[PDB]
């Protein structure tokens with residue numbers, strides 16, 4: 724997270740830290756708990772073996788609130804396009820359910836086909852880097868402002884307003900960064916987006932997967 728602040732510890736109990744493939748440091752992403760046995764994250768964060776950490780603040784310490792569970796299944800959206808980075812969403816079925824408490828619980832998802840008005844303030848959080856030079860051991864967050872689709876539509880070639888969201892005022896040095904992928908975009912306490920991609924510079928506006936466009940796929944994957 725660029726330009727954010729450290730989150731109050733354990734105030735976002737749905738946040739997940741993903742350790743993708745061995746050794747310990749092959750690749751990392753964020754994610755969020757949507758049910759006691761399912762984690763939603765970005766499809767581009769896919770890996771052969773994924774270790775999910777829940778209940779964390781400082782990921783470099785053995786905290787008693789932490790729960791480590793390996794993903795039993797990593798279900799990428801069937802239409803995920805790695806080239807255009809379209810349909811960048813994936814469900815992680817945990818090998819075992821989380822033991823639900825004040826430090827570990829699901830986030831509310833939006834209703835299907837639920838849009839978002841440009842100018843709306845949303846919060847994004849993660850353990851990604853804060854700059855090109857340094858990272859963070861603890862959870863951070865930042866408030867980003869939703870942009871008109873029209874704006875990303877002329878910056879990113881494969882942008883699709885119906886499945887993605889344009890986020891971030893270019894006039895502020897606030898954005899998600901490397902390692903924050905898969906993290907939630909919470910607008911009015913509901914997980915509306917998933918960190919996906921942007922300019923390498925980290926210069927807004929960036930692109931988030933629009934969660935409400937995938938509800939039927941979400942409900943079918945978790946039910947079945």
Ligand SMILES: *P(=O)(O)[C@H](CCCCN)NC(=O)[C@@H]1CCCN1C(=O)[C@@H](NC(=O)CCC(=O)O)C(C)C
Pocket residue numbers: 752767808851898899900901902903904905918919920921922923924925929
């Ligand atoms: P996530 O931690 O893996 C990362 C989050 C970037 C947040 C930027 N505000 N996403 C990420 O690296 C995605 C998936 C792989 C490709 N992504 C990149 O974003 C790349 N950028 C683009 O393709 C767009 C480049 C542009 O039009 O200038 C780079 C950053 C690797």
